Amino acid sequence: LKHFLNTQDWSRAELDALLTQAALFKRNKLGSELKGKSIALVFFNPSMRTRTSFELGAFQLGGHAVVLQPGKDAWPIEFNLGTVMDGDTVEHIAEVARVLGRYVDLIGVRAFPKFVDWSKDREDQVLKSFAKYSPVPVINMETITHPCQELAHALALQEHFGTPDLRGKKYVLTWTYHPKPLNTAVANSALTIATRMGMDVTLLCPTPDYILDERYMDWAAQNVAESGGSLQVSHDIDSAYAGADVVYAKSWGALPFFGNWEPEKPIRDQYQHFIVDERKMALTNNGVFSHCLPLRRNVKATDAVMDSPNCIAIDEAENRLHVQKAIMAALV
Amino acid sequence: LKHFLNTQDWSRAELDALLTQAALFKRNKLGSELKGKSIALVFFNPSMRTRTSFELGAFQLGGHAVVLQPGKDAWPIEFNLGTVMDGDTVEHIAEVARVLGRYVDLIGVRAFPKFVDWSKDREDQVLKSFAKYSPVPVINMETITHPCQELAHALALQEHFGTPDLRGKKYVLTWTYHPKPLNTAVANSALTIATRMGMDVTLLCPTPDYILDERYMDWAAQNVAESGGSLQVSHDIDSAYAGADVVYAKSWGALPFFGNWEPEKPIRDQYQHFIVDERKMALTNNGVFSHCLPLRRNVKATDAVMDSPNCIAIDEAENRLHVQKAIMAALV
Amino acid sequence: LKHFLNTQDWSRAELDALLTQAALFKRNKLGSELKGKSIALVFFNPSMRTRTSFELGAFQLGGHAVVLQPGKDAWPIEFNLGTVMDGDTVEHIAEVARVLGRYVDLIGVRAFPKFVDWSKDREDQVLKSFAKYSPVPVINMETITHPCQELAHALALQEHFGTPDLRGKKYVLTWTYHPKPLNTAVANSALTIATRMGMDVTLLCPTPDYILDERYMDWAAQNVAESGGSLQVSHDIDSAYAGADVVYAKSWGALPFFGNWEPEKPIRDQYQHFIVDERKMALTNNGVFSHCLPLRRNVKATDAVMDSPNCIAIDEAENRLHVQKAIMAALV
Ligand SMILES: CCC[C@H](NC(=O)CCC(=O)O)C(=O)O
Ligand SMILES: CCC[C@H](NC(=O)CCC(=O)O)C(=O)O
Numbered sequence: 003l004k005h006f007l008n009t010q011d012w013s014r015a016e017l018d019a020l021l022t023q024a025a026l027f028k029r030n031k032l033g034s035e036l037k038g039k040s041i042a043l044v045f046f047n048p049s050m051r052t053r054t055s056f057e058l059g060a061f062q063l064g065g066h067a068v069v070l071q072p073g074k075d076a077w078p079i080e081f082n083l084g085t086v087m088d089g090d091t092v093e094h095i096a097e098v099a100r101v102l103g104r105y106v107d108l109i110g111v112r113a114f115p116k117f118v119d120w121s122k123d124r125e126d127q128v129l130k131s132f133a134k135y136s137p138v139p140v141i142n143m144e145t146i147t148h149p150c151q152e153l154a155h156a157l158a159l160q161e162h163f164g165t166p167d168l169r170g171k172k173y174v175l176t177w178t179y180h181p182k183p184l185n186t187a188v189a190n191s192a193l194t195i196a197t198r199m200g201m202d203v204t205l206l207c208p209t210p211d212y213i214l215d216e217r218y219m220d221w222a223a224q225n226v227a228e229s230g231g232s233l234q235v236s237h238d239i240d241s242a243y244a245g246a247d248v249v250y251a252k253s254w255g256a257l258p259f260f261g262n263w264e265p266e267k268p269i270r271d272q273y274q275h276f277i278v279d280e281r282k283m284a285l286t287n288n289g290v291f292s293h294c295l296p297l298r299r300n301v302k303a304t305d306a307v308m309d310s311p312n313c314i315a316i317d318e319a320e321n322r323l324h325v326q327k328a329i330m331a332a333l334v
Numbered sequence: 335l336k337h338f339l340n341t342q343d344w345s346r347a348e349l350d351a352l353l354t355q356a357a358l359f360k361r362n363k364l365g366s367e368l369k370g371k372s373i374a375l376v377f378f379n380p381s382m383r384t385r386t387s388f389e390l391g392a393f394q395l396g397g398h399a400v401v402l403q404p405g406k407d408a409w410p411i412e413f414n415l416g417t418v419m420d421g422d423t424v425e426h427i428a429e430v431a432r433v434l435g436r437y438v439d440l441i442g443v444r445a446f447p448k449f450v451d452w453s454k455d456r457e458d459q460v461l462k463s464f465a466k467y468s469p470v471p472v473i474n475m476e477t478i479t480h481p482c483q484e485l486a487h488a489l490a491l492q493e494h495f496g497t498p499d500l501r502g503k504k505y506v507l508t509w510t511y512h513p514k515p516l517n518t519a520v521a522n523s524a525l526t527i528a529t530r531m532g533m534d535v536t537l538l539c540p541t542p543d544y545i546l547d548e549r550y551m552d553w554a555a556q557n558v559a560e561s562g563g564s565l566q567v568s569h570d571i572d573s574a575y576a577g578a579d580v581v582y583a584k585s586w587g588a589l590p591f592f593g594n595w596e597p598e599k600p601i602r603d604q605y606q607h608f609i610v611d612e613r614k615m616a617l618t619n620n621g622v623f624s625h626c627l628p629l630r631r632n633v634k635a636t637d638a639v640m641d642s643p644n645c646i647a648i649d650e651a652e653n654r655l656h657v658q659k660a661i662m663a664a665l666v
Numbered sequence: 667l668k669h670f671l672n673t674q675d676w677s678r679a680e681l682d683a684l685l686t687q688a689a690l691f692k693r694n695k696l697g698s699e700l701k702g703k704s705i706a707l708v709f710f711n712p713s714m715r716t717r718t719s720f721e722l723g724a725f726q727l728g729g730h731a732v733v734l735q736p737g738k739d740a741w742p743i744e745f746n747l748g749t750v751m752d753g754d755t756v757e758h759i760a761e762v763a764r765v766l767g768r769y770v771d772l773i774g775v776r777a778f779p780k781f782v783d784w785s786k787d788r789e790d791q792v793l794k795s796f797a798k799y800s801p802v803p804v805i806n807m808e809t810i811t812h813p814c815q816e817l818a819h820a821l822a823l824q825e826h827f828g829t830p831d832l833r834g835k836k837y838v839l840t841w842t843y844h845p846k847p848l849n850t851a852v853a854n855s856a857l858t859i860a861t862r863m864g865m866d867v868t869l870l871c872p873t874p875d876y877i878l879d880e881r882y883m884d885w886a887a888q889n890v891a892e893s894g895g896s897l898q899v900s901h902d903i904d905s906a907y908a909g910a911d912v913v914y915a916k917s918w919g920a921l922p923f924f925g926n927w928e929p930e931k932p933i934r935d936q937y938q939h940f941i942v943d944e945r946k947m948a949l950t951n952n953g954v955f956s957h958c959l960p961l962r963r964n965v966k967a968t969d970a971v972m973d974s975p976n977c978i979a980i981d982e983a984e985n986r987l988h989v990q991k992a993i994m995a996a997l998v
């Protein structure tokens with residue numbers, strides 16, 4: 003059974019096919035690839051773009067999306083095995099998955115880490131659980147990786163440079179400020195897709211503490227070795243931005259401090275200058291700037307940068323609808 | 335780009351056309367004016383009638399409604415410009431609108447005032463923001479005015495009197511009791527539509543403190559001067575109800591006391607007799623009584639009055655579905 | 667006007683017809699029995715299976731479901747008559763029903779008891795209110811009885827034994843442990859359907875305190891007298907499980923202790939051994955085990971029992987979708 007948990011699990015040929023069908027669905031939004039079918043969208047965290055682009059994509063394809071929010075409407079799920087359920091968890095994913103598997107044709111899930119212990123959050127238990135017990139294809143709507151966002155990003159880029167081949171482009175994935183520590187998910191997915199697309203990726207972040215987990219720094223290496231691109235870390239802003247083609251901002255907490263954020267507040271606070279501003283965008287080769295959104299203005303980026311024509315975040319967001327339709331149509 | 339923020343922005347010819355298409359949709363509920371299209375319903379406050387009649391109207395027209403509740407499911411939005419987003423607001427309406435604008439064909443928004451400072455609430459910032467940044471038509475689902483409800487009301491009336499011409503009818507818009515101060519929105523919209531329809535509007539309320547904002551009292555004046563009707567204020571019950579044709583109840587807090595309700599509690603509390611009862615309905619020319627709902631029984635109106643055959647609140651509510659389908663079909 | 671509040675209100679011929687159309691819809695999921703129609707699903711409590719199977723069933727039949735959650739999205743309703751609404755209730759069911767009656771073709775409602783006073787909860791006020799004021803057919807999505815679940819259960823059984831006639835089968839409806847006291851609804855519905863299907867029902871529970879309300883113990887009697895089966899109470903486990911064909915577990919609080927659960931905690935706590943385990947399932951005539959779900963693993967049943975092939979809870983759950991489509995198609 004084929005799922006869509008990470009782009010990494012897919013071959014370059016399949017990804018390529020996915021971006022093209024995306025491009026296609028973008029030319030003709032309506033179809034019947036999902037006529038009579040349906041998908042259960044399970045959210046354990048907030049969402050606007052994801053929720054909306056999926057709910058519409060299913061409608062635009064003849065299917066129907068059923069949104070579920072365990073804890074709000076649906077019953078809270080248990081993921082640990084053999085555990086004795088006498089706490090707050092009402093049912094077990096082993097039953098929930100097999101059941102959704104009787105009503106729907108697809109299952110999408112969204113569950114940000116709990117931020118208490120990275121060791122435990124890096125196992126991506128919810129998504130893996132779903133994938134294991136579900137008799138139907140499972141789709142990552144973001145956990146510790148945001149595969150869907152990756153393709154939307156990749157397409158917005160291929161669109162911008164007028165070609166599918168993005169090799170040779172200097173891609174700068176920059177960390178950026180945020181009053182509180184956020185999920186690394188997108189940063190990981192960015193690094194993964196940027197390296198996979200064969201670009202000259204530069205992971206810009208404040209201190210070595212902010213470097214992404216090894217798994218992802220390693221997936222990146224294999225991608226370079228494959229796409230003939232390159233990965234590189236930089237703690238110096240200007241040296242990075244210097245003549246870039248693409249610039250993706252994303253704030254996230256330092257993994258080492260998981261479960262111990264107190265000592266990090268003072269640390270991140272001294273890097274607010276990482277915000278993406280015109281000055282930095284000036285240092286680029288008329289580069290394009292993007293973000294997954296929701297973006298906090300004048301914190302992650304400046305009003306100028308957002309209103310700037312080089313900001314393709316809106317297009318990238320819209321592609322989420324086309325990319326996801328390609329993923330669903332594929333999986334069925 | 336044409337929106338539907340207020341009936342006032344529309345010419346009488348257009349409104350007239352809207353009520354007729356409403357009457358039409360009421361004869362044949364199913365159509366394809368929205369085939370393949372969709373609308374994002376953004377609610378910052380509770381709703382039953384609005385949510386339901388829109389969600390169904392879109393379905394009855396081949397479209398699809400995507401309900402969003404910033405703060406519950408979707409991410410909380412920021413409306414102030416240049417502000418530095420390091421608080422509770424996660425994204426800015428400038429991005430949210432442009433984005434929804436990539437997924438949907440229409441956007442509906444509902445945001446009651448915050449009741450802290452009328453000066454700030456009277457600017458209808460959320461609706462105006464949406465209208466400004468959205469590349470697609472925006473629809474007022476109620477803010478400081480309830481345009482949609484107006485047409486539902488106007489149609490229920492034209493239906494009741496068997497004619498579109500409601501001139502000459504004595505329309506009494508009466509304030510009514512409620513333990514807590516409520517939005518003036520409906521009262522404004524009532525005054526606006528009643529005067530616009532050319533009736534003999536009488537704004538009945540306890541003290542001059544309860545008279546509606548100037549903007550609305552002025553829109554009303556221009557409507558009289560146009561429709562050849564009349565506006566009038568009354569602090570005396572009986573003199574008002576006296577031989578009326580229409581009676582619309584609605585409770586709301588006194589604008590002067592915005593942000594300072596403590597001193598108003600004792601004031602409203604001494605007007606509970608404003609409740610709509612049989613006695614008052616007796617003083618009318620076999621008039622018809624209505625309310626936008628949700629109505630608190632035996633507080634705003636008496637059980638008798640509601641169960642009375644002259645109560646057309648249920649029909650008025652149902653029209654909300656027909657009126658709104660006319661508005662959507664129009665806007666696309 | 668015909669509703670679906672309880673299976674009891676229906677004749678055996680109608681129920682029989684319902685299970686067959688269910689079996690049918692199970693062979694061909696898509697249809698147009700609900701083309702253009704819609705149903706308002708009102709939930710005053712959490713739900714996963716019910717919400718999802720209804721929302722999809724309506725979609726699979728050309729209709730549209732509109733989910734409403736009074737208190738979350740929709741406004742909180744008042745059910746008591748003549749009461750003076752100056753509290754938390756915003757509108758009255760008399761208006762809500764008549765209104766939904768103008769937008770939808772069907773209304774489903776879910777409202778678990780309040781657990782404060784059984785005397786008051788046994789009147790099933792919400793469902794009865796809905797049925798009374800609604801001009802359209804009302805469907806019990808579970809209150810003090812779970813009619814829908816009954817048919818899903820009955821079908822999963824007829825499917826398992828390869829025949830519609832389940833007479834002669836030893837049906838053991840066993841109470842089971844749960845840290846907190848739960849609704850008796852399902853237990854009642856089980857007793858009702860098991861006896862109605864003409865099986866040898868045995869109500870297994872700890873102490874006479876746990877025996878279900880008289881109404882249900884009496885409906886059961888009349889069912890036996892009709893279906894030629896039998897009802898029986900057992901406080902001894904083994905004597906019950908002993909060579910059974912069907913085993914339905916369900917935890918619920920002792921009715922006598924309604925509003926006074928303190929003194930029951932210590933009582934239920936000494937019956938955790940009621941959990942359904944392999945040992946007990948061994949004592950059965952290769953019986954089949956089921957539960958309505960959501961089930962708390964290693965509390966109500968053991969991991970073994972759930973993963974056991976005799977556990978038909980997943981199939982029973984899936985039937986909820988087929989059974990409910992038969993109920994809707996019928997009611998319109
Ligand atoms: C697609 C982005 C989802 C998420 N974003 C947040 O939860 C940020 C919340 C905030 O800044 O208030 C994240 O960090 O990955
Ligand atoms: C269509 C009416 C919406 C709203 N009503 C309320 O929020 C009243 C709430 C209450 O009375 O509990 C208002 O005052 O305009």
Ligand SMILES: CCC[C@H](NC(=O)CCC(=O)O)C(=O)O
Nearest residue numbers: 092848849851852958959960962
């Ligand atoms: C279909 C079952 C619905 C409900 N179940 C619960 O509310 C159990 C909640 C829990 O065990 O946490 C009940 O008891 O009837």
